[PDB]
Structure 1
């Protein structure tokens, strides 16, 4: 059984050097692959294992030298498989790739940092191995920026990082498999403890095989409640315990620069928001009942976690010396009816006052859970609302009383233990863990107000000009008469909108965040949501957040927001705070990526100018994809790259589902995520990036013109482009496939304009081509190099000295690292008409030229020259991904073309090609993670 020696040789040939000396990635992945292949031999036979290992070896040789002969060598094997063998092989490479990710995570979490590797500039913030931790950021602020420790502390006090969980564009990984990945990571890490005993190591090996098999032997498009349940798992996994540890580390770093206070436990440095069950944009499956469900489910998970956390808190709080105030409350609580701690104590006596009060809190938490459960499964309760906590103050008040009393009695250290962590958990997570944003297209609000005005015999709000719409909406917001009643013809859509508002109205305000308007263009959209909110009797209306998607919408955004701030009603409703959302993926679908990047920098600049004008605190909400959508260290520089004063201590970022596991799956990875978001926000508030030189802005304006020209000329002007897109890519199968929880085309008939951003990026990411990400950069850089000899030098200056530019270029280079034109050529050869075959050749030439020009700008000879660790990990995944690519291509040809008969091979073991296609989609998706 000498197969391990060969896979060892191929892994060492794929990743030759050591990116450090704790570089155990090759060792880790070799171990996981040996154990997996032994299990595979045991379950589906020797023949299956030999076939699989032959496929992987060819894949590694290809990712070695990129010989096109290797790809046909893979294909000859993969097409001769009957659907059963195809499914077993595809499943196998999916789990192998997953194991590579798990090993990769262990490497990242236990890679020792290097102090001597820091260069001293902003480039260090692009990798976790050199980025500034919390305290290095403090000493950067104190030494270089001449900020006082008091100023840093006060900034932290008023800072908020708000992380928004969004639905996975594909497989939102089930909670059970998250747990299994956790056990696998734990077993790996412990197996490499330089102190492990022989028996412990054997039992760890046996647990590792056991877990790999457990994950490999498990097989609707999950209901939005199920996907939400799955998306919330990271709170149980790492975030709940991780948050108080991080805040405590903030306290320590403050003590180490002379600050004697701790960060106030009620200061919302960390907040969590969710779109799961709230985003309705082109998703009729997200109903009012779905939103109510995920709201109550969230309140349930929160009550459970607080309930379970408060018993160990009750065990710790056994003191007797206390406040006069606390003693009064304890004697008060002692006057009542003790069912949830009989296993611990028959009853809580009055000489343990903290235990009395805390026991009453535990009882109210129990009634809170049971009521939320009763509302969820029925629609009414009988549990008195006064016997529960309804707002955060009812909850915080007795805990704060305990804290005051303990400090009163010289027991402050005890208070800074389980109690401080608990208080910080209540402040971070509230009664819901997350606050749900609601998202809907503006057009639906136009439809509702149009049915309303037509019903009042005043005309059609839709035909009205923007100014007339604003004037009517303003006259209604300032009036006292209601707008409509039950007597109102509602279409299914109009009734959905109003019913969603009624459900928001009947639920606690702690569950909701922002009302997000998709395709927002004008102030009347924002006023429409505010009016519909008020007239549906929502007592505390949500803050309305416009989403400006298209490029023209971005240009018109600061005028519309200034006009909104200028009207007295909206100015008194917002009370000096406004949140605006900009969409990177969406805008890229409109006008290419380079143009969306520069337009979003300028648009944020102008929005900040308006916000300073009217005295409003602006919060920029960064949607999905983009430069702000990356994993790990790059994000630190991403945040540092935003224009000066666009953050100002209030950051709101989408954590894309395709990165959320790499970011919160493990204890260390999670802690470092929270650390870098907080540190980059704090530093940016006190140390903005440089203002761009005037020639830099002129150069980017021209490049923006050329890049949007090329992008629209290929994507939108070419007549046969849509046919090519439907052939050289699995877009049709992705939409038909019940994969994306929502549908792809907003209007089923329409073109790419109506195609959503997620399938737009996905379709080209599956083929390792990524055209929506890089297209346009080529002609823009060619144009400026040819127009003036010196512009290359200017470009190289920007990449070296302008953070915004460096992060934009860095993203293009990274996406090219995940690209391989040869595989794309295979897709062309199998799936595209001969009439249309030369077209892909031209686009591929553009791919190569764009790659060379990006290298020239970054001063690099190879891709990712500055981040060898990431190059290593990506090169590792590519060996598995390439196999899922070839399998997906031939499977597509077999699905579309029943006239393509293959010489099948005999069944292998196990002692429908649609399923295999879905496997390859999920696999390739999991191996490429984030692109644009």
Structure 2
């Protein structure tokens, strides 16, 4: 079995050099791959394994020299597979790619930071290898900017970093498989301890193989397209994985860094430097599976998970808190609590003596935590309870008060060190996670609210709120919000949709405010949308109404946004309701779908500038909420510079960002990855408040305005004006298959009969990610740079000045370059040849030329000859993934030709050893061609991760 000698060779040819001296990535991937291939052989035979390995080697040769002969060879092998073998090959390559991502996480997580590799400017902040840690950022603020430590500490206490978890656009991988990935990562890591004993190393190898096989032998389909509650349970995995333990660890490190510049205090235990919000179960925009009851369910589930974790943690806290000397106040509380009926620690003590007052108070808190979980579970499972609300924690102050009493008391007695142990970690967890871990945002289209108001105004014979001009809408909305009469009752003709909207508001009213974040209006355009939501909130008896957040998606919505926000602040009722705080949401991907990526990036910079102008004019604290697709939505290092790049004063101590589902594993799956994530968010926020990026030279603005015009013209002329483009998009791309299959819970279009305008941005991105073409990300850049270069020979120099000195531009280009690295036009060509009509082939050809031209231009702009010349670590990891992804592409393409064309008979090969073909019985397509397709989609999706 000298088979290993082959994969090593291929791997080392894929990543030739070393990206450092602790570069063990090729080693890691070889080890994992060898163990996996042996498992494949032991379960499905020597022939199956030899086939799979020949496929991998061919793919690696392709990602090396990009000879199309290699694609012809891969295809030749893959078409001759009957559905059984096709499923096993696709599954095989999905799992192999997963293992590659695992070795990547280990390598990243243990790479030694090179203090000599820092250049000294902001470019260092674009990679984890040279970015500033917390303390380095403190020293940067103090030295270069001559800020006093007191100013840094004060800035930090009032800072909030709000991470919003959203559902994954495809396979939000099951919590079980995450657990397995963890065990594999740990086995890998421990195998490379430079001090390990032979028997230890043996048992670790056997454990690694054992877990690789375990993960391979779990189905990844069947059952249901998981219900929204299931998707939410899966999203909450990272709290148990890393985040719960990770928050107090990060905060304590902040304490140390503050000590290391002379600050004697710690960050206050109730200060919300970290917050977590969730859309899982709250975003109903174009997702009818998300019902009112779904929202009630995920709210209660969250309250359960939080109470559970607090329950388990408070027992170790009770064991720690064995002191006797205490404050007079706490002694009073102990004697008071000692007057009662001790069920949840009979294994520990028959009862708790008054000589352990801390243990008394804490034991009572433990009792209240148990009753909160039991009552939430009864509310979820029935609808009523019998657990009195007076015996649980209903708001966060009830919970914090006894703990703060213990802390104060301990400090009174000079036991501050004891107080700063498990107790401090507990207080910080209560403050960060509250009673729910996450706060659920609600999201709905503006049109649904307009429908509701129109049904009401029709029911009152006042006219159609829909037909009303925006000024008439505003005037009516204002008179009603200021009025004393309720608006509607049960006697109201409600369509199924209008009933959905109102019932959602009623659910919101019947749940604790600690559970909710923001109500977000998709497709916001005018103040009447926000006012409409505010009115529906009031007239549905939502006692503590949510903050309303407009999501300005389209380009015209962005230009009109600051006018709208000004008009909203200028209204007396709204101005007093917001209490000096406004949060606006921007969607990088939505605006991209509208008007191309370059024009949307620049328009979003300008729109944030104007919104901060309005917020200062009227004295409101503006908070920008960054939706998916952004520069700040990337994974790892790049996030640091992306945040630093935001226009001055757009953050101001409140960062709200979407943690994309395709990135959450790379950012929170591992202990170090999580810590460094929280760190770069906190450090980037803190620094940007005090050290904004340079303001752009006026010529830079004028240039970007012109480029945006040309770029929008090209993007729209292709996507929207070319009549046959929609024909091409349906052939060269599996967009239709994505809409039909059990990959995401959402419909891909808002109106089934519409063109690209009615297509949601996620299937738009996804469709072109699968073919490694990435049109939605780069289309429009080519003609823009081409235009400015021809318009004046010297504009190229200006662009290069921007990339080297203007952060926003550098990060935008950098993102484009990263996406091009995940691109391969040759594969897009394979899809054309197999799936697209002949008279449409030149169309694709022209598109690919644009692809190529743009790439060259981006390179010229970035001053690079190769893609990602400045980040060889990422270039390496990407190349390693690409070798697996390419096979999944070819398999996807031929599987598509096989599905769409039953008149494409192929010379099948004999089946390859023991089955997986009988796990999808009720399939209308072939015995396992639907499953093969789903596998390649989940796989390519996992390999390409994030683009735009």
Alignment TM-score > 0.5, same fold: yes
Partner of 1:121: 121
How far is 1:888 from its partner?
Answer: 0.2
How far is 1:747 from its partner?
Answer: 1.1
Are the counterparts in 1 of residues 36 and 212 from structure 2 also a CA contact under 8 Å? yes
CA distance in 1, matches of 2:173, 2:896: 25
How far is 1:739 from its partner?
Answer: 1.3
Are the counterparts in 1 of residues 632 and 638 from structure 2 also a CA contact under 8 Å? no
Within a 5 Å distance, the mapping from 1:155-194 to structure 2 comes to 155-194=155-194
1:712 and 2:716 aligned? yes
SS in 2 for 1:836: helix
Partner of 2:659: 655
Q: Which moved more, 1:507-516 or 1:452-461?
A: 452-461
SS in 1 for 2:893: helix
1:618 and 2:622 aligned? yes
SS in 2 for 1:792: helix
Within a 5 Å distance, the mapping from 1:211-610 to structure 2 comes to 211-219=211-219, 220-610=224-614
CA distance in 2, matches of 1:498, 1:823: 48
Residues 194-220 of structure 1 deviation map (CA, whole Å, 9 limit, x = unaligned): 000000000000000000000000001
Partner of 1:202: 202
How far is 1:324 from its partner?
Answer: 0.3
Unaligned stretches of 5+ residues in structure 2: 915-927
Are the counterparts in 1 of residues 24 and 107 from structure 2 also a CA contact under 8 Å? yes
SS in 1 for 2:723: coil
How far is 1:628 from its partner?
Answer: 2.2
SS in 1 for 2:288: coil
How far is 1:560 from its partner?
Answer: 0.4
How far is 1:616 from its partner?
Answer: 0.3
How far is 1:384 from its partner?
Answer: 0.1
SS in 1 for 2:180: helix
CA distance in 1, matches of 2:443, 2:684: 28
CA distance in 2, matches of 1:584, 1:28: 36
CA distance in 2, matches of 1:213, 1:738: 25
Partner of 1:25: 25
CA distance in 2, matches of 1:562, 1:352: 58
CA distance in 2, matches of 1:478, 1:6: 76
SS in 1 for 2:912: coil
CA distance in 2, matches of 1:410, 1:628: 44
Residues 260-317 of structure 1 deviation map (CA, whole Å, 9 limit, x = unaligned): 0000000000000000000000011100000000000000000000000000000000
TM-score by length of 2: 0.98
CA distance in 2, matches of 1:259, 1:545: 37
How far is 1:581 from its partner?
Answer: 0.3
CA distance in 1, matches of 2:716, 2:421: 59
How far is 1:355 from its partner?
Answer: 0.2
Residues 628-686 of structure 1 deviation map (CA, whole Å, 9 limit, x = unaligned): 22110000000011000000000000000000000000000000000000000000000
How far is 1:457 from its partner?
Answer: 1.4
Partner of 2:802: 798
Residues 335-377 of structure 1 deviation map (CA, whole Å, 9 limit, x = unaligned): 0111100000000000000000000000000000000000001
Are the counterparts in 1 of residues 292 and 507 from structure 2 also a CA contact under 8 Å? yes
Partner of 2:945: 929
CA distance in 2, matches of 1:172, 1:58: 30
CA distance in 2, matches of 1:909, 1:682: 59
TM-score by length of 1: 1.00
How far is 1:245 from its partner?
Answer: 0.4
CA distance in 2, matches of 1:731, 1:210: 37
Residues 858-882 of structure 1 deviation map (CA, whole Å, 9 limit, x = unaligned): 0000000000000000000000000
CA distance in 1, matches of 2:648, 2:280: 32
CA distance in 1, matches of 2:717, 2:488: 48
CA distance in 1, matches of 2:650, 2:841: 46
How far is 1:565 from its partner?
Answer: 0.5
Residues 91-125 of structure 1 deviation map (CA, whole Å, 9 limit, x = unaligned): 00000000000000000000000000000000000
CA distance in 1, matches of 2:621, 2:497: 34
How far is 1:748 from its partner?
Answer: 1.3
How far is 1:627 from its partner?
Answer: 1.8
Residues 817-840 of structure 1 deviation map (CA, whole Å, 9 limit, x = unaligned): 000000000000000000101101
Partner of 1:14: 14
CA distance in 2, matches of 1:493, 1:567: 30
CA distance in 2, matches of 1:514, 1:430: 16
SS in 1 for 2:74: helix
CA distance in 2, matches of 1:296, 1:425: 19
SS in 2 for 1:546: strand
CA distance in 1, matches of 2:31, 2:745: 36
How far is 1:380 from its partner?
Answer: 0.3
How far is 1:843 from its partner?
Answer: 0.4
How far is 1:738 from its partner?
Answer: 2.0
CA distance in 1, matches of 2:861, 2:934: 38
How far is 1:626 from its partner?
Answer: 2.4
Residues 603-641 of structure 1 deviation map (CA, whole Å, 9 limit, x = unaligned): 000000000011000000011112222110000000011
How far is 1:726 from its partner?
Answer: 0.0
SS in 2 for 1:318: coil
CA distance in 2, matches of 1:751, 1:373: 45
Residues 781-836 of structure 1 deviation map (CA, whole Å, 9 limit, x = unaligned): 00000000110110110000000000000011000000000000000000000010
CA distance in 2, matches of 1:83, 1:146: 67
How far is 1:456 from its partner?
Answer: 1.1
CA distance in 1, matches of 2:368, 2:337: 12
How far is 1:694 from its partner?
Answer: 0.3
Are the counterparts in 1 of residues 834 and 894 from structure 2 also a CA contact under 8 Å? yes
Residues 865-916 of structure 1 deviation map (CA, whole Å, 9 limit, x = unaligned): 0000000000000000000000000000000011100000000012x20100
How far is 1:436 from its partner?
Answer: 0.3
CA distance in 2, matches of 1:236, 1:628: 25
SS in 1 for 2:277: strand
CA distance in 1, matches of 2:723, 2:483: 52
How far is 1:751 from its partner?
Answer: 1.1
SS in 1 for 2:657: strand
How far is 1:163 from its partner?
Answer: 0.2
CA distance in 2, matches of 1:735, 1:806: 35
Are the counterparts in 1 of residues 157 and 267 from structure 2 also a CA contact under 8 Å? yes
How far is 1:753 from its partner?
Answer: 0.3
Residues 515-568 of structure 1 deviation map (CA, whole Å, 9 limit, x = unaligned): 000000000000000000000001000000000000000000000000000100
Residues 70-93 of structure 1 deviation map (CA, whole Å, 9 limit, x = unaligned): 101000100000000000000000
Residues 19-71 of structure 1 deviation map (CA, whole Å, 9 limit, x = unaligned): 00000000000000000000000000001000000000000000110000010
CA distance in 1, matches of 2:345, 2:356: 15
SS in 1 for 2:168: coil
Partner of 1:860: 864
Q: CA RMSD in A?
A: 0.4
CA distance in 2, matches of 1:176, 1:309: 23
Are the counterparts in 1 of residues 229 and 297 from structure 2 also a CA contact under 8 Å? yes
How far is 1:147 from its partner?
Answer: 0.5
CA distance in 1, matches of 2:79, 2:722: 33
Residues 130-159 of structure 1 deviation map (CA, whole Å, 9 limit, x = unaligned): 000000000000000110000000000000
How far is 1:740 from its partner?
Answer: 1.3
How far is 1:496 from its partner?
Answer: 0.3
CA distance in 1, matches of 2:386, 2:744: 39
How far is 1:492 from its partner?
Answer: 0.2
Q: Which moved more, 1:265-274 or 1:624-633?
A: 624-633
CA distance in 2, matches of 1:861, 1:519: 41
SS in 2 for 1:914: helix
Residues 705-728 of structure 1 deviation map (CA, whole Å, 9 limit, x = unaligned): 000000000000000000100000
**Structure 1 residue ranges, 4+ long, deviating more than 3 angstroms after superposition:** none
